[PDB]
Amino acid sequence: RTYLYRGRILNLALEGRYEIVEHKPAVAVIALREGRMLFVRQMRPAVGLAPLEIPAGLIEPGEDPLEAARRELAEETGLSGDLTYLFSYFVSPGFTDEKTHVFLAENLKEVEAHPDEDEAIEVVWMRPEEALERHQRGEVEFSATGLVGVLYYHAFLRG
Amino acid sequence: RTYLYRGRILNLALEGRYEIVEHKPAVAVIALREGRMLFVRQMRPAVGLAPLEIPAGLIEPGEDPLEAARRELAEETGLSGDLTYLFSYFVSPGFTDEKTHVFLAENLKEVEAHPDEDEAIEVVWMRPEEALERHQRGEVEFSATGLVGVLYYHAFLRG
Ligand SMILES: Nc1ncnc2c1ncn2[C@@H]1O[C@H](COP(=O)(O)OP(=O)(O)OC[C@H]2O[C@@H](O)[C@H](O)[C@@H]2O)[C@@H](O)[C@H]1O
Ligand SMILES: Nc1ncnc2c1ncn2[C@@H]1O[C@H](COP(=O)(O)OP(=O)(O)OC[C@H]2O[C@@H](O)[C@H](O)[C@@H]2O)[C@@H](O)[C@H]1O
Ligand SMILES: [Gd]
Ligand SMILES: [Gd]
Ligand SMILES: [Gd]
Numbered sequence A, B: 001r002t003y004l005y006r007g008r009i010l011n012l013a014l015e016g017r018y019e020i021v022e023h024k025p026a027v028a029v030i031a032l033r034e035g036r037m038l039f040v041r042q043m044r045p046a047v048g049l050a051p052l053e054i055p056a057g058l059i060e061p062g063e064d065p066l067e068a069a070r071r072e073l074a075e076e077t078g079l080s081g082d083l084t085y086l087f088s089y090f091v092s093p094g095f096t097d098e099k100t101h102v103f104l105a106e107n108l109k110e111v112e113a114h115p116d117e118d119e120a121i122e123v124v125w126m127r128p129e130e131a132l133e134r135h136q137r138g139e140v141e142f143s144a145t146g147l148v149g150v151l152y153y154h155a156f157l158r159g
């Protein structure tokens, strides 16, 4: 495996004829409250639009999945909760090793008296049914984390 | 956006401080039959293991999503069926523009008298319940397509 580029959140390498992109692992948090799921949107230069996602981020040096999940939820929404590990997935094993760990957040609580808002992120509480409905009409795009959250909801959280 | 590398299935570029990986779009096919979902496994150099996935592939030049879906299902499993577009998602909008289009395949039929097997792929018909169960114990890994298929099943195909 020879490297062509070593960067901030990724390295580009070649293994034979295989182009490989090493990428830090990540976390995603599904949070439901009063029939609404906590989605987030932000400027995504790579795609040129802001898809519907759920709180998520890269695991930082020194962090395990659970810890990164707590930090991302706290930093992007100013919330904490009781987290439960659900499952993980490789975003695109055909070229990258980025692995995402998904958690469920319950009993949401303000991290502090007056949470410090994240300017780069837009918090969007929305019924998972609406997110899917709108996506089906081509009105909104999904990130893998957003779609996984929506599907997980329909499969195990309704009622 | 300046390019550092132009390759076969991806280009590495820089947009300001953002590292961007342009990648061809892809397709995935969820197929259920007799309580079993059609999963596939193959050597994935990027991750060093063979996660549980569903028939999937890159959209080739000249193809639209539906056509690529038909080809991948045919080439990886030797099957055809009535396809229905379900939804799409960006695998990791934080660094790549790879977008995946998911379809449902019903009324599966042999593409030909004696289907030509794909040596690089391992076809694994398995109950989605078992896939999830085993993954939960750390016995098998999931690709985004595999997890999406499993969750979709639990949300809309049981009964
Ligand atoms: N990183 C790579 N570099 C060069 N050639 C590759 C690579 N990955 C696959 N190939 C070649 O392309 C052919 C398969 O093409 P695809 O139709 O795109 O399917 P595949 O890559 O096997 O799986 C596609 C989808 O699953 C996930 O891994 C990923 O998200 C991707 O969108 C194979 O015969 C293989 O030789
Ligand atoms: N391509 C990039 N290049 C350089 N810096 C980046 C990039 N993407 C994000 N950043 C920087 O990192 C910080 C955010 O880090 P993360 O915690 O990793 O979260 P984010 O990248 O915003 O979303 C993470 C997850 O969602 C999906 O887009 C993707 O699958 C990723 O795993 C931001 O302040 C931003 O400046
Ligand atoms: Gd984030
Ligand atoms: Gd972050
Ligand atoms: Gd504060």
Ligand SMILES: [Gd]
Pocket (backbone or CB within 6 Å): A130, A133
């Ligand atoms: Gd609606």
Ligand SMILES: [Gd]
Pocket (backbone or CB within 6 Å): B055, B056, B057, B058, B072, B076
């Ligand atoms: Gd494939």
Ligand SMILES: [Gd]
Pocket (backbone or CB within 6 Å): B056, B057, B058, B072, B075
């Ligand atoms: Gd293929």
Ligand SMILES: [Gd]
Pocket (backbone or CB within 6 Å): B112, B114, B115, B116
């Ligand atoms: Gd044949």
Ligand SMILES: [Gd]
Pocket (backbone or CB within 6 Å): B130, B133
């Ligand atoms: Gd079992």
